[PDB]
Design a protein around this ligand. Structure first.
Ligand SMILES: [Zn+2]
Lengths: 216, 733, 294, 206
């Protein structure tokens, strides 16, 4: 068979997220580090490169039994899952991390929210001379959702990695429920929460009855 | 014939006693003392009386003689009928400008770039001992034969290329003596063939006491051959191909040797030799031949034979186009209208032959069918003589090209009958080192970039090639030892701006047609040959690059980008010293990443090259067609003024690193009216943010930066953006 | 000889012996073999061959169509104030790579016209690949049209012809057809009086070929004795349907369009069938002309 | 029988698209990797070759042979040179509409980087994409011969299945990080110079 499987999920923000964007020289008093927004709707967009590369750099610590000097040196548990540039059979690596374009806006404007991107203020104080240095950085608002989805494709090339990859990706989702996923994380941004990890086999003879009993 | 060589040597060694009487300051004329020099070196009495009795008062002391030829061989070879230096060829090019004079030195390998000026108007009397006695060394015991017909035609190009003639003059003052001797021997061969094909014997009356009869007789041919398919044969390389520079060097050197051998097969098929061929360049080559049926029918015979050769191994991927203008002794000041209307006659014959390509038997043999073909030599799409070089199916010419690319690094090139790439009918060409020379069999050997003779008595061709490192590590040789610099490789394709117009019209802009002669054009094209085919190995000497192709009006030089930019800087800043600022060159330099293919890269380099061409008369195009400056604006403002201020400003401080440079580049690139206000905010906000010690450096730099940023010209803005791009690429970690 | 069939492509790939280059016009072997192969998809090959081996019909290769007629430069025929060398020597470089002319001064061209060639239909080159393969950088050249230029083959307005020409709309006419190139749209117009009068075939006069030609083996000598032309090597592989092989054709050297003559000839359908191959390979070259001054 | 029918569709870009072209210059702060463009209008266009093999890289993953040979073509296999499909490009039909949604240029610049795994140093990119929900003209000429007339309706459940999978894969480049979800619409089946009725097909596609 050929089994493409779609992982419907709800990225709900808490401690609202900022992904970087155009640090091309913006206006004077305006936002210094603006968020990347989808140019049709101007809602915040969490692109798939942040998700895939962040889950790459976080599953580095989990499933690379050896220390990895670079993402080419990922093991053959992650090279088949996130792609690899120098491996023989692990190019085109089976996971299309689709984006999310701020799914709810009829809900988030039903709550009395002016704009979906707050402009939180920040500065820095040097320890010597204590000079201030202010900045206005853009973030998405707190209780947003994000209709995020994966595409895992099973081409009968594996035939044994049915659940050898979902214990990896589900615990990566747990990592992202703990770690920040995007932007100035160590100041406490991002903090996505993954809700309703709904897998559905959009192509293939396959059941989720052995899948969502682990993915909860 | 045997007497033909004697006439050639006797007319060619004219004014050799001028070098001697310039060396020692001797008596009445060069005419008597040159024959004394010839009597002192060796023994040939016919050549001796030829040098004895060439003058008007001297030829009566001879007698028929070989000297009544030798007089009229000289005066038509001269454009007109002491202690001065050689005037500039570019003194008669252009308009009334800075007048320069040459400096008398010999030629040496990768040593001298003798730029003319006014500081060499004083005269050198001691260097003749380094020249004339030098000849008295190397031409001490010179046997007068055809095997050494070659190296003596080398020798004047080594020795008398910077030595003038007619020192005590006022108007016509820039003829070098070596090319004058080449033209004099060519005219002697022309007179000898025209007078020995008509069977005339007594030259004492029809040449001497009635000089006007032959002097107004259309008895000369200005022949040419334009090669066709040259750039298509060079750029037959495609993307994803083995030979990056090996293939391209081999192809555009093999075409150069083909354009040399078309001459060297045209001349010995007649009685002629290298003195009759005036200029060989990028396929185009111009001659002086005689006018008879034994000239013309043999020309058309070898035209059809060589066309059968090119059709046999190429199938119309190359085409020789002959053409011969019939002309009298008219090109002596009528001199405006004497050159131009009949030099174009051979050019209109070139256009006539290049468009009525072949005859019925050849094309009837061409599309006669009779071939079952499955495999192709996908280099040239051909089928003939297919072999299986390195598990790919290529032809024999496209395998001898790989042998030629392996043997180009040698210094000599013999012509065999079955070894190497074919350059003519039963004439193949194979490279060879110096010590392997006298063992193998040959009939003509070339040497690349020499001035002394060598071993097998070679013809001294000139083709500037270089390999500092190989082509695959000009990426790795781009960073400095610190790691500062970006792993790039830049490709420059120069082009001389309208060398067709500088060749065809050129000097004819000046004067009333007084300088619209052939000798100045041959000397100018030999000067372009001597720069673009020898001297580029001097400007590329310490710098790390590879001159893939050079010559004529094109230089394709790949290499590392700092050395490529500095090599273009030094090439034009010594070209405008070489060419007095006239003939500005229009280079195009593109950055390309590591291991990107070259026919993908040569196409973009050519696109930037033609966008730099159409800018004005000249421009550099750097890293993209929107960075298009005059060279007079590029090296002076960016690479001398702005880049050093930018480098010193960021070296002698450590707050403003690369983020500030990136934001300055972006404000230089977007640049609406409001971005000048944003930059006036940016520099002033950083002005009070730097530390108090090195603060006024920032204050004078923002004062000096807002000068060119808001300069309202856009001639001082993209310059600064490119200066910052060059600095960022120089400090890349 | 009759009305001409306008074809606007917007995406063309036109040979030139290689893959990395592309022409603008297609030398009338491509359109002929497209009508021939399109007939074989219906089994209708025999009907077009019965038309083809008889001289009622004609053809003419492509030329630019921007609101009307463009024709070749008469190749080598601008006929020869011989001063002011900065102009009359300079303009020959800008009047040799011109190669396409307008009818409304094509008789002013022969008397001497400037003819700034407009930049209709710029040839583009776009790189392409093959993923997970060893050598993949094959550079597809692409002849991309400037939103009004068309190509207009000139032929006898036949219904067996027009079934083929209205199937070639969706068959594609160019190099990389199944990659989405050469798909034109067809809209037939009339001919002006100053063109269709001059579409002669036997006028013993100073005449110019309007398509890539090849004469009778008797006529070839008298063709070359007056001809000013080029050759331009009609070559390439042979596209059949019963091979499991790919054989080259027989290297037919045509007389490319713009071939001027005097005492015009009779062209032919020169078989360049591969040696011991089942069916013939037609390779049309018979010329529909244009009187230069007549 | 002789028949030529075409697959009219508007393609929709639910994310960006990176389909790379000929690189020119980094230009210090300029876009690093551009998308391929029409040279006349400088508009983002999916080339037809990108549309062709991307279906082939998905039909081979299901239909495995002879059906891929008859659907696309081959170098060998004498029956199946020119394998009964002709594509075209995708010329951005909604430029009249996209001035009314309100957007400056239809190409955005997704910024990106490369955090090193140990050095922890970034490495930024300016990846140019074509913006969301742009609808492109898409036409696919299937041609029907007499020999194919057995399994023509079978092959029409492969091209439809070839576009049901292309809405589950990226149809572009760098598409494992998004840049896909490319959804077809108005996926009809007209007929164009061929007397074979498309009423056996239009309820299966639409
Ligand atoms: Zn070849």
């Amino acid at each position: 068979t050929f089994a493409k499987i779609k992982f419907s999920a709800q990225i709900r923000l808490e401690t609202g997220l900022h992904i970087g964007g155009s640090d091309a020289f913006a206006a004077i008093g305006a936002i210094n580090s603006p968020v990347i927004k989808d140019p049709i709707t101007n809602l915040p967009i969490i692109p798939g490169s942040s998700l895939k590369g962040k889950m790459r750099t976080l599953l580095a610590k989990v499933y690379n039994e050896k220390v990895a000097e670079k993402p080419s040196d990922d093991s053959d548990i992650l090279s088949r899952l996130f792609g690899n540039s120098k491996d023989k059979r692990f190019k085109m690596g089976r996971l299309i991390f689709r984006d999310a374009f701020l799914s709810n806006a009829d809900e988030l404007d039903s709550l009395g929210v002016r704009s979906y991107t707050e402009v939180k203020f920040e500065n820095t104080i040097d320890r010597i001379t204590a000079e201030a240095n202010p900045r206005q950085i853009e973030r998405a608002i707190r209780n947003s959702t994000f209709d995020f989805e994966l595409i895992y494709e099973i081409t009968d090339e594996n035939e044994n990695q049915v659940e050898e990859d979902f214990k990896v990706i589900r615990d990566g989702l747990k990592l992202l429920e703990l770690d920040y996923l995007g932007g100035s994380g160590s100041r406490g941004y991002g903090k996505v929460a993954f809700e309703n990890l709904k897998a559905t086999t959009v192509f293939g003879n396959y059941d989720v009855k052995t899948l969502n009993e682990l993915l909860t | 014939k045997k007497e033909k060589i004697d006439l050639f040597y006797g007319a060619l060694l004219h004014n050799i006693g001028k070098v001697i009487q310039r060396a020692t300051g001797e008596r009445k004329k060069h005419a008597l003392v040159g024959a004394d020099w010839f009597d002192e070196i060796a023994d040939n009495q016919v050549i001796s009386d030829q040098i004895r009795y060439h003058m008007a008062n001297y030829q009566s002391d001879k007698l028929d003689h070989l000297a009544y030829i030798t007089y009229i061989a000289d005066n038509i070879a001269s454009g007109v009928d002491t202690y001065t230096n050689q005037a500039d060829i570019f003194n008669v090019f252009g308009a009334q400008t800075d007048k320069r004079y040459f400096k008398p030195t010999v030629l040496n390998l990768k040593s001298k770039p003798n730029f003319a000026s006014a500081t060499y108007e004083p005269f050198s009397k001691g260097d003749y001992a380094a020249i004339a006695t030098r000849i008295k060394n190397e031409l001490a015991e010179f046997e007068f034969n055809q095997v050494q017909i070659d190296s003596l035609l080398n020798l004047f190009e080594a020795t008398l290329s910077f030595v003038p003639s007619s020192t005590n003059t006022k108007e016509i003052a820039d003829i070098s003596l070596a090319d004058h001797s080449r033209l004099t021997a060519a005219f002697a061969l022309a007179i000898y063939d025209y007078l020995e094909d008509k069977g005339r014997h007594n030259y004492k009356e029809d040449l001497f006491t009635k000089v006007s009869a032959f002097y107004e007789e259309e008895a000369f041919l200005l022949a040419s051959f334009d090669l066709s398919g040259i750039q298509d044969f060079i750029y037959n390389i495609n993307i994803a191909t083995n030979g990056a520079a090996k293939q391209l060097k081999a192809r555009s050197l093999y075409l150069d040797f083909m354009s040399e051998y078309i001459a060297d097969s045209l001349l010995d098929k007649l009685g002629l030799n290298r003195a009759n061929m005036l200029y060989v360049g990028g396929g185009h080559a111009y001659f002086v031949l005689a006018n008879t049926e034994k000239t013309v029918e043999t020309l058309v015979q070898f035209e059809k034979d060589f066309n059968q050769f090119l059709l046999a191994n190429f199938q119309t991927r190359l085409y020789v186009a002959f053409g011969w203008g019939s002309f009298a002794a008219k090109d002596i000041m009528n001199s405006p209208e004497s050159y131009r209307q009949v030099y174009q006659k051979a050019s209109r014959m070139i256009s006539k032959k290049k468009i009525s390509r072949y005859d019925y038997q050849t094309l009837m043999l061409l599309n006669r069918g009779g071939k079952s073909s499955e495999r192709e030599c996908e280099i040239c799409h051909s089928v003939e003589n297919l072999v299986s070089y390195h598990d790919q199916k290529v032809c024999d010419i496209c395998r001898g090209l790989y042998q030629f690319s392996k043997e180009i690094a040698h210094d000599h090139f013999i012509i065999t009958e079955n070894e190497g790439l074919p350059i003519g009918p039963n004439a193949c060409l194979k490279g060879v080192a110096f010590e392997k020379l006298s063992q193998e069999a040959f009939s003509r050997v070339y040497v690349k970039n020499d001035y002394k003779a060598g071993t097998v008595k070679a013809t001294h061709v000139f083709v500037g090639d270089y390999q500092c490192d190989e082509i695959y590590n000009y990426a790795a040789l781009s960073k400095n030892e610190n790691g500062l610099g970006i792993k790039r490789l830049a490709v420059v394709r120069l082009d001389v701006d309208d060398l067709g117009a500088a060749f065809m019209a050129g000097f004819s802009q000046q004067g009333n047609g007084q300088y619209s002669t052939l000798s100045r054009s041959a000397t100018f094209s030999r000067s372009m040959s001597l720069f673009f085919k020898v001297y580029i190995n001097q400007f590329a000497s310490d710098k790390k690059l590879s001159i893939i192709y050079a010559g004529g009006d094109d230089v394709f030089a790949i290499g590392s980008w700092q050395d490529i930019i500095a090599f273009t800087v030094e090439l034009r800043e010594n070209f405008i010293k070489w060419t007095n600022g006239k003939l500005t060159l229009s280079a195009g330099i593109g950055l390309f990443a590591d291991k990107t293919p070259i026919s993908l890269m040569a196409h973009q380099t050519g696109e930037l090259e033609e966008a730099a061409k159409g800018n004005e008369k000249d421009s550099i195009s750097l890293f993209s067609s929107d960075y298009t400056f005059k060279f007079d604006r590029f090296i002076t403002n960016v690479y001398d003024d702005k880049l050093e201020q930018i480098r010193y400003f960021f070296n002698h401080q450590d707050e403003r690193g690369k983020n500030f440079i990136y934001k300055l580049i972006e404000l230089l690139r977007n640049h609406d009216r409001m971005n000048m206000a944003r930059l006036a905010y940016y520099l002033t906000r950083l002005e009070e943010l730097t530390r108090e010690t090195d603060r006024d450096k920032f204050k004078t730099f923002k004062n000096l930066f807002y000068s060119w940023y808001t300069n309202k010209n856009d001639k001082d803005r993209k310059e600064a953006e490119l200066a910052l791009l060059l600095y960022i690429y120089e400090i890349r970690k | 000889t009759y009305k001409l069939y306008i074809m606007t492509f917007q995406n063309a790939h036109f040979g030139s012996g290689t893959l990395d280059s592309s022409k603008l016009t297609f030398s009338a072997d491509r359109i002929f073999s497209a009508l021939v192969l399109e007939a074989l998809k219906m089994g209708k090959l025999d009907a077009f061959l019965a038309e083809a081996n008889q001289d009622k019909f004609t053809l003419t290769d492509a030329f630019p169509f921007q609101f009307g007629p463009f024709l070749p430069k008469p190749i080598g025929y601008p006929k020869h104030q011989s001063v002011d060398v900065k102009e009359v020597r300079r303009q020959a470089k800008l009047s040799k790579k011109l190669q396409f002319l307008a009818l409304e001064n094509v008789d002013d061209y022969l008397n001497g016209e400037l003819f700034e060639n407009e930049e209709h239909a710029v040839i583009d080159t776009v790189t392409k690949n093959q993923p997970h393969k060893d050598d993949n950088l094959y550079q597809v050249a692409t002849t991309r049209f400037s939103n009004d230029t068309s190509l207009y083959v000139i032929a006898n307005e036949s219904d067996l012809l027009n079934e083929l020409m209205s199937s070639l709309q969706y068959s594609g006419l160019g190099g990389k057809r199944s990659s989405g190139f050469g798909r034109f749209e067809l809209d037939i117009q009339n001919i002006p009086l100053e063109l269709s009068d001059r579409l002669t075939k036997n006028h013993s006069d100073k005449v110019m070929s309007l398509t890539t030609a090849l004469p009778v083996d008797a006529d070839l000598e008298e063709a070359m004795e007056d001809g000013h032309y080029l050759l331009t090597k009609s070559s390439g592989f042979a596209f059949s349907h019963a091979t499991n092989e790919n054989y080259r054709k027989q290297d037919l050297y045509k007389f490319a369009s713009g071939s001027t003559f005097s005492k015009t000839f009779e062209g032919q359908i020169v078989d360049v069938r591969p040696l011991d191959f089942p069916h013939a390979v037609l390779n049309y070259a018979k010329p529909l002309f244009f009187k230069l001054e007549v």
